[PDB]
Design a protein around this ligand. Structure first.
Ligand SMILES: *C(=O)CSCCNC(=O)CCNC(=O)[C@H](O)C(C)(C)COP(=O)(O)OP(=O)(O)OC[C@H]1O[C@@H](n2cnc3c(N)ncnc32)[C@H](O)[C@@H]1OP(=O)(O)O
Lengths: 106, 9, 96, 46, 274, 113, 93, 80, 270, 87, 94, 106, 92
DNA sequence: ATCGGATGTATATATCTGACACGTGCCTGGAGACTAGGGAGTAATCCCCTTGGCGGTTAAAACGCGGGGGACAGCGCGTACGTGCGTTTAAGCGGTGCTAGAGCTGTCTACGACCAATTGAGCGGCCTCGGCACCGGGATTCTCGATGGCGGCCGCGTATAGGGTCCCCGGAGGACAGT
DNA sequence: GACTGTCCTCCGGGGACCCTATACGCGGCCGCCATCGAGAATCCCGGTGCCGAGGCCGCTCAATTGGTCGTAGACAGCTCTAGCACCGCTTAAACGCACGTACGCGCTGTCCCCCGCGTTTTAACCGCCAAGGGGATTACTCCCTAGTCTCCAGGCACGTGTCAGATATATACATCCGAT
């Protein structure tokens, strides 16, 4: 009987097996449930998809076909929820959002 | 659809 | 002759540097400062280039955030010139 | 007939009375007009 | 949604008259009470009582309007002297005991209207406004109605008062009971919950002197001006009645002169400028 | 007894009074303009009759004397209607002002007690 | 020596969301670091949840509760939807 | 090494301020900024060196800096 | 049981806390100007013989060749507004007379006749609304329903909201009929604005030009398919059905509220 | 038509004197009138976040009662460790 | 009549000298249950949990007022204003 | 052979055995060194001694013989290093340090 | 039965101030403090062991964690106390 | 700067309670002692990459000289915030009674740990080319100060106007001369 | 000498062009709007040119399967704490209102200091060459710690007594504020 990847059984792209192994070797609990790695991989894949979608939109908005860290910074800092999630994170080569205070303008 | 922002500004 | 009014060049620089994303500090002086500071903990320490680059990135990001807070404080006092007491206030509010 | 002439004299006197009353009412109307104007000035301007 | 499409046949009977549209938008703040007249309306029992016991063979006619004036005066007097008549309806005052209050009663601002009718110099006629129905001018004064029929009407109205246990003849909306501030039944409504009782003022004289008296003076000034304008309109009315009388008398005089063929002395048949 | 409540209630009751007074006074003005116009309309005809009598006496009848008299009667009657309307309007306005004045007087008397 | 990463899966997701878009190496490193960060956060929170209730097994329930704790609003809602859907589909076959 | 903090010059500081959105700068700002930077660097380098010594290595790796920033609540992406 | 308002005998829809004596009457008489109730035909006749009111007891702030609008304070006209609320409970199961009529403003639309102004509908309004509702209760007489009158009432409510420089929404527990009517009004106004504007427009500009709340706009956009996500962004979507509905709207030529005939200034409450 | 009296707000119970007392303990000498409303809003936001996390812990434990330890854990998750109730 | 500020200073000393809670317990408890309704119905509460919530809330508010006072002093004023609170929370990262 | 507590072998008051057990049952690592619980217990005892000493001094300074949370708050907030260590900690019934800004004084 | 550091805190108090008592709430605060410091140190030691791919928590990891968490003189004196204690224990 | 009046706050004392301090019996968590495997220490190795030098190019830092404009002090008005007092509200306390549900215990199954045998996905190394960076020329509409101009208040008389001002106008009476 | 009529000189009063009002003709200036030219805003089109990203290809080793075994945990039943809820009395505290001042705020004037720009000077940057420390690797081998099984006394629950401090009361001292 040929083997089917647990990712394919769950219809996921992220490696369920690698996640399960990292959980076992991460000293988190004595035992690991069967569905927990599947759930975690699904959540990670979803968040990756959200960020990649926003970064792709930003890259198109800058007439670029290759995503660079600047696009990641713009995508994250322009999303309220993602910005709140990553409020204590610094992105290398990310830059800053263009923002000029009104009172300084003539 | 799976993603957010069904309707925003 | 031609001269721009004070503050126009400032706004132009603000737009320029908010548009770009390169490090604004000179590499070598920063590295010399880093090694100078590190001498006071252990003698003859070696540094990977990436470690110095990460330090420079973190330092510049921290200073940029501090300057934004300082600008907000200066504006709160109905001024446009940031002063040392603004920095002290910002760091105090943060908890430093 | 003296009856119709008596009615004629009665109507003549009554019409003279109504003519006098008409003139008096016209005069009173003009007086009230001026009094209203002066009172308006007093109450609202002054 | 349930149907509402049924038409009433007596609409033309109950809805008559004509309302005139004004060029400028209507300006109005008077209440419903101002434009309705007597607050009491006779029912079938009241009209049968009046027709069969009061107006069946009387040489002096008591009108339905005068009947409602009497019943309204009895109501008001009873609520004034006996606010708690519903506590003991059988102890209701007699007609003679209530009569002095009826004499001193001021129903529908009658005293104010009479004072105004005196001030306009229009007390020859009566004081009539747009808020008053035309039919109620003819009614006799209240005091006359009291002297002629007060006991006769009051006995019947007292009987009906007792029948309704000292309450109102007209069926009333259900009211909040102080015992419980929340009433389960829907019936209880329009209660106190939309009034907000204020703080009392033990020591406020200043406001009364400063602004109340000044505004009273301004109202007096406006009343004087309106009285002058009303008198001007009264004299203009007298003038137009003079013009009508003069025209009729002039045409009669001219016809009589032409019948008798009398010449000259035509000055009174024509107008003279002055 | 609340003086401030009395003042507030009096001002509220008189808040719409000047607007209604302006409305009534200008309706009386419009009716008086209609009265003046109808006065011209029938004064011209009465001038015709009077001048006819001045020149030829009262015994001869004007060829349209009955029609002129009926027209004068009509114009005078609608003048009477206009004046009735003006008088009623003025009576209503005076009623409102005197009612407010008397209510204020009653409240002032109660506060004076 | 083999040093594992998440790069290929990020690339697959990028191809599924923007088939005509590429990514620089530095951005791929940033994404890999972000994934490791979120993984560590969620696993730590799940460990604390298991410890508080004196359990010795990390099940799907703990992961779901940790996600609800860490993700704000609609992010949490959609992440829970995705997790439940994926677990159901895996349980099916 | 001594007084290399003067390497952080006036134009570099004002460049950082411009990126931060500052329009007008007092002359006294620069020394304060240098002091703040020195404090920050000392705090980070101390932990970095502590990680390096615990691993018994004589070379500071980037991961040591990353772990120090993580310990100070300043997580950094883009270095592993 | 059944009520005779003016010439129309109506069949009530729900309970209304009238005096039980009227629940004991076969016929209920309602004055067409004062809204007074009667169980006695004689009292109705006497009242009509003495009732001189031939228009809503308030100032006329609007008038066209068809209808006029009157602004009435519940505190000033307490009995009349109580009569209105009592009559209104008969046609909404959900009306609340648990509170008196004082803090409510009543804007009543009437049609003029030789007998006077005939009320066809109205909408109430809290003097001080915390939720920002520009309409509290809106009742249109069933003998005048399905005639477009409710549309005109909503038009006037938003005209007031524009005159107040505010956005407004009806009390959110809308009835099925009220919900459908507001769906129709919102759809018609949004389509008319979109077609006549002919340009890309911001949501806040729509809300400023129509006094409609942005939430209403968004919910209508979800009910419709006006907004589409196409090429990484949401954009105006000019499909066939939209223009077809706009053409049916242009062909119906419905009555509209003329703002220039509104001589009215917002009341000031202390 | 008011449907439910569930809209009652207890945030008002945070009276002006209480807010003044808090400011006095904080060293405030003069207070603008709008401070009280701003404070009520800030407190509402803070309590909503903390309570949300506490209820999440309670539901995870499949208990109907919110314990003190749940509150402590929520504060821990917000970086506001509290001493004097356990753990 | 004491001049404005003397009583304020006396209150400052009095309340910095004590440690008791300054909010009445019952209104706070009702507010807590009201906010709790919005996540799950018929939730029950231990008293100690409510007391811990009140402790944390009062400490947070005191710290916020200290920061606000510093901001007000910075603007050369002595009356705190909502803008000062907004600035404090903004700088804090909230 | 009678048993001697590991605390007595290390001359400590804190329970070495309890600390070792908590380490084993705390899911920190696969294995626990022998001296680690001793070291940790010693450090905890030292910190406890420092705080108790400062609190006792404060209690004497307030003419009290029983330490209350107020004394703990004063002791912690008056020590620069302890204050830095507990900068994110709130002490119930602890109060605040008396501190009046100069500009507010007359 | 619920365990706590109460008796050990009491012994330390009697060592430092024999004539001073403590309220129960203060004892609870101290117990929470002890548990907090324990968790912080243990977590830091676990992270150190993981970063160096070791599966054993030795005293060296504890010492490094203490140096990371405790500021200055506190760290120096804590390290001194731990070293002395370990030394005395290893000779017994 | 000096002094008295009035309020708060610290101080001395006495009483009364409950929470802190201490005692006991118990058991279960820690101390002994033993084994076996493998994590970790150690040695020895390779070569990467870190450090450290030279020397040319030139961007950028440093320096200096205006001067405009923003920080700063003063000052004058008024609102609004603090203070005090009397009225009103409900928080607080205590007391009673109920039952949801937290907590515990005893079942026994299902699931996850574990190991061995299997193999393909994913990693490291290896190309290959076009997306993106650079190096030019080019290039409309957007800001900003500048002054020219249609037309309004005011200088500043002028054409007309209520009216000070007195030499002449009107008819009627007295003296020289005539009918 | 008396009476009728015509010339000339004197009281009473119309008047005529007037003393400096009065109001606008007819502009100065001035005032803000009406264009209106100069710099400028980086941006843009197009080669072109490389090197990083993406595709291929072995080759493991980590992921899969298929068993087996043991216990964590799911579940049912049961106890009883404590959370909730209502009643009723006390009074501390909140609330409302009236009053006055001192603080915020706007505005005006001063000046010194930071921006802009031009010129000079440094030294960062880069490309290149070279050594060798030490990070990374592998291969061995010890001994330390998990796991077991036994043993018993430290620490917990749980009772028990009394004194530190809360509370109350009476009092002297410190602090604020008005008066001089
Ligand atoms: C709480 O939020 C307070 S608001 C609710 C207060 N109560 C309340 O409204 C109940 C009593 N009044 C009404 O419900 C009243 O009818 C109104 C206020 C809804 C006004 O309705 P109208 O009928 O007068 O409104 P129109 O402008 O004429 O439009 C009517 C639309 O409704 C459709 N309709 C009506 N009855 C229908 C049935 N039985 N079946 C189908 N469609 C029905 C009409 O077709 C028309 O639709 P349009 O698309 O043409 O507008």
């Amino acid at each position: 009987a040929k083997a089917k990847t647990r990712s394919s059984r769950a219809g996921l792209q992220f490696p369920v097996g690698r996640v399960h192994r990292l959980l076992r070797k991460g000293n988190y609990a004595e035992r690991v449930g069967a569905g927990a790695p599947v759930y975690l991989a699904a959540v990670l894949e979803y968040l990756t998809a959200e960020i990649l979608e926003l970064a792709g939109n930003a890259a198109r908005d800058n007439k670029k076909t290759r995503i660079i860290p600047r696009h990641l910074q713009l995508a994250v800092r322009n999303d309220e929820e993602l910005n709140k999630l990553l409020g204590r994170v610094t992105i290398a080569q990310g830059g800053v959002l263009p923002n000029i205070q009104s009172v300084l303008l003539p | 659809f799976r993603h957010r922002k069904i309707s925003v500004k | 002759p031609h001269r721009y009014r004070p503050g126009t060049v400032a706004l132009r620089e603000i737009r320029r540097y908010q548009k770009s994303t390169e490090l604004l500090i000179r590499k070598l002086p920063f590295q010399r400062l880093v090694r100078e500071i590190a001498q006071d903990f252990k003698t003859d320490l070696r540094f990977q280039s990436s470690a110095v680059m990460a330090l420079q990135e973190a330092s510049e990001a921290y200073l940029v955030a501090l300057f934004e807070d300082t600008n907000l404080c200066a504006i709160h006092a109905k001024r446009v010139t940031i002063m040392p007491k603004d920095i002290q206030l910002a760091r105090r509010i943060r908890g430093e | 007939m003296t009856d119709e002439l008596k009615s004629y004299e009665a109507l003549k006197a009554e019409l003279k009375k109504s003519l006098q009353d008409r003139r008096e009412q016209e005069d009173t109307f003009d007086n009230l007009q001026q009094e209203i104007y002066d009172k308006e000035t007093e109450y609202f301007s002054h | 949604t349930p149907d509402a499409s049924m038409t009433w046949n007596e609409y033309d009977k109950f809805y008559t008259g004509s309302f005139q549209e004004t060029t400028s938008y209507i300006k109005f703040s008077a209440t419903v009470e101002d434009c309705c007249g007597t607050n009491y309306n006779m029912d079938e029992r009241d009209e049968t009582f009046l027709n069969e016991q009061v107006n069946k063979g009387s040489s002096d006619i008591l009108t339905e309007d005068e009947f409602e004036i009497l019943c309204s005066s009895f109501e008001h007097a009873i609520h004034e002297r006996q606010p708690f008549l519903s506590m003991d309806p059988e102890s209701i005052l007699s007609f003679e005991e209530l009569k002095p209050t009826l004499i001193k009663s001021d129903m529908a601002d009658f005293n104010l209207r009479n004072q105004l009718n005196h001030e306009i110099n229009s007390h020859k006629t009566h004081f009539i406004t747009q808020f008053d129905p035309v039919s109620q001018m003819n009614t006799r004064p209240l005091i006359q109605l009291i002297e002629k029929f007060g006991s006769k009407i009051y006995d019947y109205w007292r009987e009906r008062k007792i029948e309704v246990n000292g309450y109102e003849i007209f069926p009333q909306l259900k009211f909040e009971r102080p015992g419980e501030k929340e009433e389960i039944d829907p019936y209880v409504c329009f209660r106190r919950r939309e009034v907000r009782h204020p703080r009392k003022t033990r020591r406020i004289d200043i406001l009364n002197s400063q602004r109340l008296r000044a505004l009273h003076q301004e109202l007096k000034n406006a009343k004087d001006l309106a009285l002058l304008v009303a008198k001007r309109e009264n004299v203009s009315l007298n003038w137009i009645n003079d013009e009508l009388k003069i025209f009729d008398q002039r045409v009669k005089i001219k016809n009589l002169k032409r019948s008798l063929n009398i010449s000259g002395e035509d000055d009174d048949l024509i107008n003279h400028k002055r | 007894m609340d003086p401030s409540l009395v003042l507030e209630q009096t001002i509220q009751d008189v808040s719409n009074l000047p607007s209604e007074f302006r409305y009534l006074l200008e309706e009386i003005g419009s009716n008086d303009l209609k009265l003046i116009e109808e006065k011209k309309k029938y004064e011209q005809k009465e001038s015709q009759i009077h001048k006819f009598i001045r020149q030829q006496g009262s015994i001869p009848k004007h060829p349209q004397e009955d029609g002129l008299d009926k027209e004068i009667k009509e114009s005078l009657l609608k003048c009477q209607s206009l004046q009735r309307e003006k008088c009623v309007l003025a009576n209503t306005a005076l009623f409102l002002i005197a009612r407010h004045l008397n209510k204020l007087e009653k409240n002032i008397a109660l506060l004076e007690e | 020596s083999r040093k594992e990463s998440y790069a290929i899966y990020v690339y697959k997701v990028l191809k599924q969301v923007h088939p005509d878009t590429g990514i620089s190496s530095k951005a791929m490193s940033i994404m890999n670091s972000f994934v490791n960060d979120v993984f560590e956060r969620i696993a730590g929170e799940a460990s604390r949840l298991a410890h508080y209730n004196k359990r010795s097994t990390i099940t799907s329930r703990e992961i779901q509760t940790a996600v609800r704790l860490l993700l704000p609003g609609e992010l949490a809602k959609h992440a829970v939807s995705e997790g439940t859907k994926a677990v159901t589909k895996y349980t099916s076959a | 090494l001594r007084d290399n903090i003067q390497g952080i010059t006036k134009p570099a500081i004002r460049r950082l301020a411009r990126r931060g959105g500052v329009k007008r700068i007092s002359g006294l700002i620069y020394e304060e900024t240098r002091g703040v930077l020195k404090v920050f660097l000392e705090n980070v380098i101390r932990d970095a060196v502590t990680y390096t010594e615990h691993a018994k290595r004589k070379t500071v790796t980037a991961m040591d800096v990353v772990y120090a920033l993580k310990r100070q609540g300043r997580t950094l992406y883009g270095f592993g | 049981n059944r009520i005779i308002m003016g010439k129309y005998e109506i069949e009530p829809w729900y309970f209304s806390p009238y005096p039980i004596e009227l629940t004991d009457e076969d016929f209920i008489y309602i004055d067409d100007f004062t809204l007074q109730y009667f169980g006695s035909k004689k009292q109705y006749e006497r009242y009509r013989k003495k009732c001189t009111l031939r228009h809503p007891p308030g100032n006329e702030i609007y008038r066209d060749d068809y209808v006029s609008f009157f602004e009435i304070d519940g505190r000033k006209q307490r009995t009349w507004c109580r009569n209105l609320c009592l009559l209104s409970k008969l046609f909404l199961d959900h009306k609340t007379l648990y509170y008196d009529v004082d803090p409510f403003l009543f804007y009543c639309m009437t049609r003029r006749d030789e007998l006077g102004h005939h009320l066809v509908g109205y909408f109430s309004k809290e003097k001080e609304s915390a939720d920002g509702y520009n309409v509290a209760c809106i009742l249109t007489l069933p003998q005048y329903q399905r005639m477009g009158y409710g549309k005109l009432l909503i038009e006037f409510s938003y005209e007031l909201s524009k005159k107040e420089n505010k956005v407004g929404s009806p009390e959110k527990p809308l009835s099925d009929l009220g919900l459908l009517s507001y769906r129709a009004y919102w759809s018609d106004t949004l389509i008319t604005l979109l077609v006549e504007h002919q340009k890309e427009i911001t949501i806040d500009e729509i809300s400023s030009m129509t006094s409609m709340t942005t939430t209403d706009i968004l919910h209508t956009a979800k009910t419709l398919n006006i907004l589409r996500y196409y090429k990484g962004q949401h954009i105006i979507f000019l499909n066939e059905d939209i223009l077809d509905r706009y053409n049916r709207l242009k062909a119906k030529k419905r009555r509209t509220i003329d703002p220039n005939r509104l001589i009215w200034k917002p009341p000031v409450f202390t």
